[PDB]
Design an enzyme around this catalytic site. Structure first.
Site, PDB file in Angstrom:
ATOM      1  N   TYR A 185      -2.080  -6.694  -9.056  1.00 50.25           N
ATOM      2  CA  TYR A 185      -1.859  -6.493 -10.383  1.00 50.25           C
ATOM      3  C   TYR A 185      -1.752  -7.716 -11.567  1.00 50.25           C
ATOM      4  CZ  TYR A 185      -0.141  -1.897  -8.963  1.00 50.25           C
ATOM      5  OH  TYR A 185      -0.268  -0.470  -8.510  1.00 50.25           O
ATOM      6  N   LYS A 210       3.857  -1.352   6.157  1.00 45.93           N
ATOM      7  CA  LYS A 210       4.161  -2.706   6.078  1.00 45.93           C
ATOM      8  C   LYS A 210       4.770  -3.417   7.296  1.00 45.93           C
ATOM      9  CE  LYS A 210       4.898  -2.445   1.113  1.00 45.93           C
ATOM     10  NZ  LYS A 210       4.971  -1.380   0.326  1.00 45.93           N
ATOM     11  N   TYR A 241       7.306   5.359  -5.485  1.00 49.38           N
ATOM     12  CA  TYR A 241       5.782   4.381  -5.341  1.00 49.38           C
ATOM     13  C   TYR A 241       5.393   4.794  -3.869  1.00 49.38           C
ATOM     14  CZ  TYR A 241       2.336   0.593  -4.655  1.00 49.38           C
ATOM     15  OH  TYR A 241       1.417   0.198  -4.431  1.00 49.38           O
ATOM     16  N   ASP A 252       7.652   9.099   3.101  1.00 47.85           N
ATOM     17  CA  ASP A 252       6.902   8.002   2.956  1.00 47.85           C
ATOM     18  C   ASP A 252       7.856   6.714   3.328  1.00 47.85           C
ATOM     19  OD1 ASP A 252       5.703   5.712   2.298  1.00 47.85           O
ATOM     20  OD2 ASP A 252       4.873   6.385   0.220  1.00 47.85           O
TER      21      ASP A 252
END
Ligand SMILES: *Cc1c(COP(=O)(O)O)cnc(C)c1O
Ligand SMILES: *Cc1c(COP(=O)(O)O)cnc(C)c1O
Ligand SMILES: NC(=O)c1ccc(-n2ccnc2)cc1
Ligand SMILES: NC(=O)c1ccc(-n2ccnc2)cc1
Ligand SMILES: [Mg+2]
Lengths: 429, 428
Positions: free
Chosen positions: B18, B276, B150, B247
């Site tokens: 980003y 992750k 997210y 998620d």
């Protein structure tokens, strides 16, 4: 710890495979228990047998498996730093690899966005393209154009520029972005094809962010080759009608087609480029999306001010370290002569397949050899036929093909091609 | 390369998450080593040891360079780096699949390996869409979620990201148009669930799935919600025949104080994503699990198969280190470890509640958050934390940490002390 029989049991119950079912596989997968150099050790009727990895493990293993230099690079990096977040930090493996990739890719590709797979790198390429035109005040330029026969990955935007048939878009009615498709690019150069592509693009130009294609070789969509001059035409068309050009080199990169990158055959540079599969020499997942300074600066100067993407494992030190080793290993040898010899070996060895009743074409491009048949190749027959001959081959559709490791000796290429030649014979029953 | 040379190459050629090229407010800091909970960073040309309070974006649960994980990687490297998963299988994939099926919420019987979280989310959505096409209901193709979420950066993933946090205003006419419920509140409110159901009821015939982060929403704002909402979602989804997808890419493997965040509610989703921390922060790897019924329905449908297959699917090296990471977690009293970590964070962050610029302090398992009354200036916050021996990366108005599980009580207090001083500076 699990025995091969135990592995098969767990796998059948619990493991998805690429484009597979659970519980309805015609044939079990084969248990792999080792890989070294150009050879896999696979289990056949309880016994370990060594066979040639003719597929390079889906285009990845260009230096073979367990290359000492690549093994060593991974172990060296492991002892110092496995991974840190790329948000706010940088590191030597990322810097070294970025420097290498900007140096060896087509001219003008000065910035590098690391991601963790080919499909993601393509979505990043599309995001670059769309943010670029938004940064130019042209948000209407948001569609993609391509030619049929392509494959760009499995995520949903990637799927939208895959060949509609190969990509089974009929299963995805009302779900995918509606993109612009030109007809299948022909093998032989025909200026009328490019003229037609141009006229089609022209009527959509105000809607289009980018043209996205695989250069010279279309892989998973049918192992088709096209004259590099088409790429020259695309660069010209894109330049004149103000549409970005994106080359997807995730399969073609790092020497596979006889040039360092397939774009080099045509001598043109895209605005954005994707690389992936062989980037790490087949060790680990890693991909990269490169773009010009202009693309980078326009995105950065836009009202958004940043490229809005950031994978968790962006620029992973371990994967970057092995890639650096893999790229240097390729560059540090006469790779051009290596690939030429391989291409010669493939042509020589596949030549007798032309006369076979079921064969419609035999074609070679660098370290890629293809026999196209007139009917689908039965895996239940082909796979054990090749294994019997010391070769791991995975046909798909009507294609018996190989993309062998660059380290394959002439005898190994003779072995691979003989197996391929024999598989097509059985096709013609 | 020297650190200065790295910085020069980085500025010219490297995108960061980003970020811009050529318009970065601050240069990234060069990292030259990581061991245990500690990073070695270059500051003013000199190396300094700092705590990885972020677990390198929530990945390093066992810290860096753990001998068991290091050795799992090198042991596998000796045998087989990788083979294509098309037509072949192998021991690391089977071992990891067996482990994952056994420890995830009940009923998740099949495992699709991919290389990142975003992809695992796309695979989840593909599963749900192919499921309903296999049931003869292709109209069920939209997704529903609640705000504040997210789910990754690929374009379908983006379509269920919070419309404000995910900058959907900048993606007008580009993203799939999904169904959004209001932000899920922290405390349990029956009225919220009732309204969620009323909204879902209006769209049930066109919804393939509800997709949410369970208990903790990460990148969308470090918000916690009452696990009872997950119970309600499960119920609503069952009655209206909409699949439920969790998620757990940020929440998995112990981070919220339960093995998976779903376990806080006793709920099993139809489809689940992990990533992750799956490899203990060594290598990119993610997985999408689904029930036998979802798997069988896809397999018996028109396609006869799930139409997805990453090049490095089930990579032996990544799978091998993940096996080691998961076994290392299960083989210790991880629940007591995370409880002790949470108590340390709670105790250490308490004085922040009184600071003038602090609006909330909240802890959930090994997650500690100071929410401030303004966006946090990184140019101030990062060096203030580095001065106190800690790598901290605020985002938006949040000063937060998700430390490695191996942090000692003293290290946790060092982290929270740095967080407090950063929050103090925000109010300056
Ligand atoms: C293999 C491939 C991809 C996708 O790569 P993954 O790593 O499998 O997601 C994209 N484009 C092309 C041309 C490829 O050959
Ligand atoms: C980090 C994260 C993702 C994306 O994973 P990547 O590996 O960065 O693609 C998806 N969902 C959630 C909840 C996450 O925390
Ligand atoms: N979605 C986000 O805003 C975000 C920010 C940072 C990262 N990131 C990844 C590694 N380091 C930071 C990923 C995502
Ligand atoms: N890794 C693999 O072995 C593999 C096989 C088939 C594909 N494939 C098939 C159709 N599209 C992708 C992708 C990867
Ligand atoms: Mg041998």
């Amino acid at each position: 710890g699990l025995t091969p029989e135990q592995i098969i049991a767990v796998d059948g119950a619990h493991l998805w495979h690429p484009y597979s079912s659970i519980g309805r596989e015609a044939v079990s997968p084969v248990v792999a228990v080792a890989a070294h150099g150009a050879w896999l050790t696979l289990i056949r009727d309880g016994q370990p047998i060594e066979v040639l990895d003719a597929m390079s493990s889906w285009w990845t293993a260009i230096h073979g498996h367990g290359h000492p230099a690549l093994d060593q690079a991974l172990t060296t990096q492991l002892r110092v730093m496995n991974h840190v977040m790329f948000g706010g930090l940088t590191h030597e493996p990322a810097a070294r690899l970025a420097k290498l990739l900007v140096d060896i890719t087509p001219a003008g590709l000065d910035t590098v966005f690391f991601s963790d797979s080919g499909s993601v790198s393509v979505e990043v390429a599309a995001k670059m393209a769309l943010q670029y035109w938004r940064g130019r005040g042209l948000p209407g330029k948001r569609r993609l154009m391509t030619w049929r026969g392509g494959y760009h990955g499995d995520t949903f935007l990637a799927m939208s520029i895959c060949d509609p048939h190969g990509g089974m878009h009929s299963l995805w009615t009302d779900v995918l972005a509606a993109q612009v498709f030109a007809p299948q690019v022909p093998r032989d150069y025909d200026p009328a094809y490019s003229a037609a592509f141009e006229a089609q693009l022209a009527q959509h130009a105000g809607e289009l962010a980018a043209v996205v294609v695989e250069p010279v070789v279309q892989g998973a969509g049918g192992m088709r080759f096209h004259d590099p001059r088409y790429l020259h035409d695309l660069r010209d068309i894109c330049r004149r009608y103000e549409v970005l050009l994106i080359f997807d080199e995730i399969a073609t990169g790092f020497g596979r087609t006889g040039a360092l990158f397939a774009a080099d055959h045509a001598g043109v540079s895209p605005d954005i480029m994707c690389v992936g599969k062989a980037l790490t020499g087949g060790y680990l997942s890693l991909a990269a999306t490169l773009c010009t300074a202009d693309v980078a600066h326009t995105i950065s100067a836009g009202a958004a001010g940043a490229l809005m993407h950031g994978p968790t494992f962006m620029a992973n030190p371990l994967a970057c370290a092995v890639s650096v080793a893999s790229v240097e290993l390729l560059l540090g040898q006469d790779w051009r002569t290596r690939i030429t010899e391989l291409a010669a070996g493939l042509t020589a060895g596949l030549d007798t397949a032309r006369a076979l009743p079921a064969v419609t074409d035999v074609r070679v491009c660098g370290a890629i050899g293809v026999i196209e048949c007139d009917r689908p190749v039965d895996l239940a027959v082909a796979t054990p036929a090749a294994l019997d001959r010391g070769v791991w081959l995975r046909p798909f559709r009507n294609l018996v093909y190989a993309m062998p490791p660059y380290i394959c000796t002439p005898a190994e290429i003779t072995q691979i091609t003989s197996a391929m030649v024999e598989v097509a014979r059985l096709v013609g029953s």
